[PDB]
Amino acid sequence: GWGQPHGGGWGQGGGTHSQWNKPSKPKTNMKHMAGAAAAGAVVGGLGGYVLGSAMSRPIIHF
Amino acid sequence: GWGQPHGGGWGQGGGTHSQWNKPSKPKTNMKHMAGAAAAGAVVGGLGGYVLGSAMSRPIIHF
Amino acid sequence: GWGQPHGGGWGQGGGTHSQWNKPSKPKTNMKHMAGAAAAGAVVGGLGGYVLGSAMSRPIIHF
Amino acid sequence: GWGQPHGGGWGQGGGTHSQWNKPSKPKTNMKHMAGAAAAGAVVGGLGGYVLGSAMSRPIIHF
Amino acid sequence: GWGQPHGGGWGQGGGTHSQWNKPSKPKTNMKHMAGAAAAGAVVGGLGGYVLGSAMSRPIIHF
Amino acid sequence: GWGQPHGGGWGQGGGTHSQWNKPSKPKTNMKHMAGAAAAGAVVGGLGGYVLGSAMSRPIIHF
Amino acid sequence: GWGQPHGGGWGQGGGTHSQWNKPSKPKTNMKHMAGAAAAGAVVGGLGGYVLGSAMSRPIIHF
Amino acid sequence: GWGQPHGGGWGQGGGTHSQWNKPSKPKTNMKHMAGAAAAGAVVGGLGGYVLGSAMSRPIIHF
Amino acid sequence: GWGQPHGGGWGQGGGTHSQWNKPSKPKTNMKHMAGAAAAGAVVGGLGGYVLGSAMSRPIIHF
Amino acid sequence: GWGQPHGGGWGQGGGTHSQWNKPSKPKTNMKHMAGAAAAGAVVGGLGGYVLGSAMSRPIIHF
């Protein structure tokens, strides 16, 4: 089967939304990876009213 | 079967929402990974009204 | 079977919501991992009104 | 069978919600792991009105 | 089967939305990767009212 | 001197307010009046979040 | 002097306000009046978020 | 002097406001009046977000 | 002096406002009046976001 | 002096405003009047975002 019927309206009723991003020196390192991954929505910096999705069925031979 | 019918409206009734992100020196390291993973929504920096999803069925031979 | 019909509206009745994130020097390390994992929503920095999901059925040979 | 029909509306009746995160030097280390895990919602930094989920049935040969 | 009928209208009821991104020296490094990945929407800098998607079924021989 | 600095914010913290007015046959009669009167706010039917005032200094000769 | 500095913000924190007016046969009669009167806000039927005022200094000779 | 500096913002924090007016046979009668009157805001039928005022200094000889 | 500096912004934070007027047979009668009156805003039928005013200084000889 | 500096912006934060007027047989009668009156804004039928004013200083001899 499988399925994700995400549904309905969404949002702010009214009023205000204030988003600030002020990081100084973030660091990300990686070394030696050989797997698989997925994510519909990834937030690095900032945002909203962001809709993502993912659907993945990879085959890896190694 | 499987399924995730996430549904209904959502949000703030009204009023205000104030979000601040001020990290100084976060660090993430990784080394030597060979598995699999998934997540519909990942928040690094900041956000809201963010909708993600994931659906994954990988095959890894190694 | 399996299934997760998360449903209904949700939010703040009204009034205010104030979220502050001010970490100084968090550090995360990892080394040598070979399994599998999943999570629909992961919060690193900050957020709200965040909806995620995950559905995963990987096969790993090693 | 299996199933988790989490449902109903939820939130704050009104009034206010104030969330502060000010950790100084948290550290997380890991070394040598080869199992499996899942969690629908994981909070690192901060948040709310966060809805996650997980559904996982991996097969690992090793 | 598989499918993700994300649907319904979404947005801000009214009022305001203010988004600021002021990172100083973020750094991302990577070295030696040979797997597969997908994500419908990825936010580096900033944005909103962003809709992405992904659908992927790669075969990798190695 | 004289003065009425009515002040401060007021209202419902949140939650609900339900007001019903269902009178059947109210009757008001008057006959032969020759004086003076004042009231800042008068509620006949129904209401709320009603702010009135009065300030009066009439001279009547008769 | 005299003065009425009514001030401050006012309203409903959030949530709901439901006002119903269903009178059947109200009757008001008057006969023979020769005075003076004032009121900043008068509610006959229904309302809210109604702000009135009055300021009156009539001279009547008769 | 005299003065009425009514001030400040006002309204509904959010949520809803539902106003119904369903009177059947109201009747108002008057006969023989010779005075003076004032009111900044008068609500017959229905309304809201109604702001009125009055300022009156009539001279009547009779 | 005299003065009415009504000021500040006003309105609905967000959400909804629903106003219904369904009177059946209201009747208003008057007979024989010889005075003076004022009101900045008068609501017969229905309305909102209505701003009126009045300023009056008549002289009547009779 | 005298003066009414009504000021500031006003309106609906967002969301909706629905106004219905459905009276059946209202009747207004008048007979024999010889005075004076003023009102900046009068609502018979329906409306909104209506701004009126009045300023009057008549002299009547009779």
Residue numbers in the entry:
A (entry chain C), B (entry chain E), C (entry chain G), D (entry chain I), E (entry chain A), F (entry chain J), ...: 80 to 141
Sentences from the paper on this structure:
Prion protein (PrP) aggregation and formation of PrP amyloid (APrP) are central events in the pathogenesis of prion diseases. The c.593t > c mutation in the prion protein gene (PRNP) results in a phenylalanine to serine amino acid substitution at PrP residue 198 (F198S) and causes the most severe amyloidosis among GSS variants. Using cryogenic electron microscopy (cryo-EM), we determined for the first time the structures of filaments of human APrP, isolated post-mortem from the brain of two symptomatic PRNP F198S mutation carriers. The protomers in the cross-β spines consist of 62 amino acids and span from glycine 80 to phenylalanine 141, adopting a previously unseen spiral fold with a thicker outer layer and a thinner inner layer.
We report that in GSS (F198S) APrP filaments are composed of dimeric, trimeric and tetrameric left-handed protofilaments with their protomers sharing a common protein fold. Each protomer comprises nine short β-strands, with the β1 and β8 strands, as well as the β4 and β9 strands, forming a steric zipper. APrP deposits in GSS (F198S) are composed of N- and C-terminally truncated fragments of PrP, formed through proteolytic cleavage of the precursor protein. It has been previously shown that the fragments vary in lengths and span approximately from residues G58 to E152. The sequence of the APrP forming peptides does not include the F198S mutation, glycans or the glycosylphosphatidylinositol (GPI)-anchor.
